[PDB]
Symmetry: C2
Subunit: 146 residues, 2 copies
């Protein structure tokens, strides 16, 4: 399984064929035990970011507000609404709010039954920072620019 970025233009998502902070919208926390998935909205102030992490469970993200850059393993991808991102199992990921004034808002869909996030260590960081674009974008407490 590889991660996919599906950019949208005029309600057509790239790579698809046309055939004829947190608000938990739907799922266990909101009173719905029936779906196999939980549906959340996240909002991040400009300059803000999610935690750089990996886990077995996948993500399906749709940007609905503002601008993002997503770290996907060895790639940094700019996003705007209504771009969709599939984050594959065990892919390192971090979403950054990159707009000037407009907060980033995105839908995030995950399995109802899912594992815990795992943080990168020194070797994880050193390996992933062999890419200059990734090194420049990622934020941990021991890693910022320079």
């Amino acid at each position: 399984e590889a991660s996919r970025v599906l950019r949208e233009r005029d309600y057509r998502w790239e790579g698809t064929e046309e055939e004829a902070r947190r608000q938990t919208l739907v799922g266990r926390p909101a009173g719905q035990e029936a779906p196999a998935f939980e549906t959340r909205y996240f909002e991040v102030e400009p300059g803000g970011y999610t935690t750089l992490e990996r886990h077995e469970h996948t993500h399906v993200v749709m940007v609905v507000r503002g601008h993002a850059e997503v770290v996907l393993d060895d790639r940094v991808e700019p996003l705007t609404p209504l771009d969709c991102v599939y984050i594959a199992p065990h892919a390192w990921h971090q979403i950054h709010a990159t707009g000037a004034n407009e907060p980033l808002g995105f839908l995030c869909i995950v399995d109802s039954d899912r594992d815990r996030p795992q943080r990168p260590d020194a070797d994880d960081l050193a390996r992933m920072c062999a890419d200059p674009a990734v090194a420049r974008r990622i934020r941990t407490e021991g890693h910022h620019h320079h």
Copy 2:
């Protein structure tokens, strides 16, 4: 059994939560393209103005987010207006049908479903008569034949 929910949105806040003739389908993340890992599939549907989805019920749920145009959704005995970015939870076994309202702007919506899921069941005459007890539903629904 669970209730269907409409969560209307204004300025990226959905009510009910706290801050802490058919459709053209694009499968954004799904099994055909090889995304077997998630427990769910994520699709975008587009319905031409005046169009409608198939009136049906099934055990599996829907989570819908309207992202384009105007909608009216039948949810059992209710007819509910929708605009982006309203979210709808369609509970197990609820009769549902989505209608594209508005002159020239197509209706576009995100639809998320379980990857492991049952087949849609159509209404017969008895189901239709039952749901047409509500005059709003009766005027809204569209069936073939």
